[PDB]
Amino acid sequence: PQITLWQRPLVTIKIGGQLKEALLDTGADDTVLEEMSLPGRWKPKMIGGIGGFIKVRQYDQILIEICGHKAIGTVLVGPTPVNIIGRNLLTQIGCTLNF
Amino acid sequence: PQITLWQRPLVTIKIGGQLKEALLDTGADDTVLEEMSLPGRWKPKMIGGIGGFIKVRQYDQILIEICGHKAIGTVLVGPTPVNIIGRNLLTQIGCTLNF
Numbered sequence A, B: 001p002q003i004t005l006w007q008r009p010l011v012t013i014k015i016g017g018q019l020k021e022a023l024l025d026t027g028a029d030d031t032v033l034e035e036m037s038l039p040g041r042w043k044p045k046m047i048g049g050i051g052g053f054i055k056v057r058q059y060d061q062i063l064i065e066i067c068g069h070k071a072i073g074t075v076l077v078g079p080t081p082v083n084i085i086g087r088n089l090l091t092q093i094g095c096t097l098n099f
């Protein structure tokens, strides 16, 4: 698909059989998801952004599906206001910017 | 061009006669640049993201050029970690996400 940017590029993801929505975000190096309790081992981590840093839990090797496309990678889980799909998973689905 | 996302989608912009690099950012509603003097009057504004809120100055109707394509629109200046080009100007230059 081609997604225009008139509105926020929110799409449906599947994670663990749940559907959710998430923002496709080319300016994020990492993927950050709203608080949830996945199984698995985590590491603590701090990620930063516009106003500062928050604390998150890092899970590795998580499979997410983005508009029917699979990707497998690290996900950070924390008190984010929005689910963010970053470049580590966008590359896997062949996603480009074009103009 | 077509930009892949294996690395950060930094490009060169020209603004107020300077060259800067900025991040092409589909997850941002707005464009935020590092502190600089632009000509023009401005309004104080607040914007947020991960981490919280920062206070910026809003300049309207600013000409900026992004990889040789012109855009005229609102630019916020303030203590951002990185120069961000958001969706208000990506749409002007015809930017889409594709996969």
Ligand SMILES: CC(C)[C@H](NC(=O)N(C)Cc1ccccn1)C(=O)N[C@@H](Cc1ccccc1)[C@H](O)[C@@H](O)[C@H](Cc1ccccc1)NC(=O)[C@@H](NC(=O)N(C)Cc1ccccn1)C(C)C
Residues within 6 Å of the ligand: A008, A023, A025, A026, A027, A028, A029, A030, A032, A047, A048, A049, A050, A081, A082, A084, B008, B023, B025, B026, B027, B028, B029, B030, B031, B032, B047, B048, B049, B050, B081, B082, B084
């Ligand atoms: C999620 C983090 C892990 C991420 N950080 C990150 O990737 N790094 C710190 C590494 C790095 C360093 C240098 C260059 C690139 N990357 C981040 O916040 N990235 C930003 C851009 C940025 C990078 C580095 C420093 C500072 C900023 C995202 O790409 C950017 O799109 C965010 C995404 C976002 C949206 C909502 C809430 C939290 C985060 N938007 C923003 O921060 C903008 N805000 C908004 O657009 N809104 C709040 C509106 C909104 C509301 C709801 C939904 C979407 N958007 C700012 C720039 C105005």
